[PDB]
Amino acid sequence: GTVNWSVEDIVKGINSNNLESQLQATQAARKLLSREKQPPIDNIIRAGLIPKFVSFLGKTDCSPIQFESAWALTNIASGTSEQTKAVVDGGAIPAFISLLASPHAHISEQAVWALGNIAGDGSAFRDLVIKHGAIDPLLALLAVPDLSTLACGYLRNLTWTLSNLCRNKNPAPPLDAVEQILPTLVRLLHHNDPEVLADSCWAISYLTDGPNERIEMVVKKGVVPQLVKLLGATELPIVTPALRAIGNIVTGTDEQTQKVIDAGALAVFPSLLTNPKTNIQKEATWTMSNITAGRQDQIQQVVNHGLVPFLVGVLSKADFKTQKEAAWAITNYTSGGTVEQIVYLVHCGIIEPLMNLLSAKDTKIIQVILDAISNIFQAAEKLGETEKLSIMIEECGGLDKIEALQRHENESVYKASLNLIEKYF
Amino acid sequence: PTKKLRY
């Protein structure tokens, strides 16, 4: 009946003075815009149908056309920034916010979805959705004693849209909006559905991707233990955002990093640092690198959890980006660590892989490795064991690589290699 | 997952 309509027929039906003909044409448009391959979004926009759909959003006496138009506009807004902008320019934001309070669950859900697409466009439309007052009705939809009484898809869409309201930077979401959303976000973070948990973790990862004040806003809500628990989850879609959020948090102050440590995060890193998913290994090694840049007691907790052998493993064999994060972790370790911690690092077998990595082409990893080696040599000097370290480096073939770096294009690598050779070789 | 189309 409403399958495979032409845009011309849809326009003829929508321009009729007959609400039922308009409803059927709007459903035909929804089905066109809901097809798998290249839905004709631009054709629908050029036909000038967005204002009519927006007007239909307000037909309280005809809920079917409200639903069909909300679906069509959702799918239009799911496209490029220009198509989302076309939806916004038609006045859709306040109409969808008004529909949030609809007595029909599917219409309210579709409005949630549409606002999620609009806000997901970027910071500007995110803040514009916020300015139109979406947060209060959105959160009211979740003001129930037990989230389990809500439909699974409804709750998933609400969580996803809220996560989009927490998303993007330059600027980050308004502080007042974040404070208004965070309690519901914690409650969702304690939900049992895997997709709700994944999207709540993504929202938290967005909110912790910023200055230490945002990280503090998040951590003061007491979510770090739940984040660590989810870090231990089996579902990769949950582990990925949980690990992102934990890394973000440990980029903050040493006290926030210590909050991460106290929750038991380090105990998960034996698996994370050996995870078969390359992205997980890279993110876990980056988190470790930011943890080793902390206090000597935090470096010591890293030691106690037996994670130095795992860092040596990652440095010995892993994707090059993970190996670079591991080199950064080693350099931070050596910069902030005690002489005892540095000699332990050496006893775990760091020198051979660290030297093998000096054959890479990237300059920055070379500089990082040279700085780490300088710090290790300084610790050895303090112990008066510089000759043993020099012999170790010379045996693994590292002295040859250092001499070959003396003729490098970068001035920093040049000078660092020459200084090492002049001081210790 | 910035945007999603409803199929």
Author numbering:
A (entry chain A): 72 to 496
B (entry chain B): 28 to 34
Sentences from the paper on this structure:
The MERS-CoV ORF4b protein is a viral accessory protein that functions as an innate immune inhibitor and strongly localizes to the nucleus, despite virus replication occurring exclusively within the cytoplasmic compartment. The MERS-CoV ORF4b protein has been shown to bind preferentially to the nuclear import adapter IMPα3 in infected cells, thereby inhibiting NF-κB-dependent innate immune responses. Here we provide a detailed, structural basis for the interaction between MERS-CoV ORF4b and its innate immune suppression target, the nuclear import adapter IMPα.
We found that, compared with WT, a MERS-CoV ORF4b mutation of Arg24 to Ala (R24A) bound only at the major site of IMPα2. For example, mutations within both the minor site (Arg24Ala), and the major site (Arg33Ala and Arg37Ala) resulted in the MERS-CoV ORF4b binding using a canonical Lys P2 involving 29TKKLR33, with Lys30 binding at the P2 site. These NLSs all bound with reduced affinity compared to the Arg P0 site. We found that mutation of R24A alone had a small effect on the nuclear import of ORF4b, whereas mutation of R33A alone, or in combination with R24A (R24A/R33A), significantly decreased the nuclear localization of the mutant ORF4b proteins.
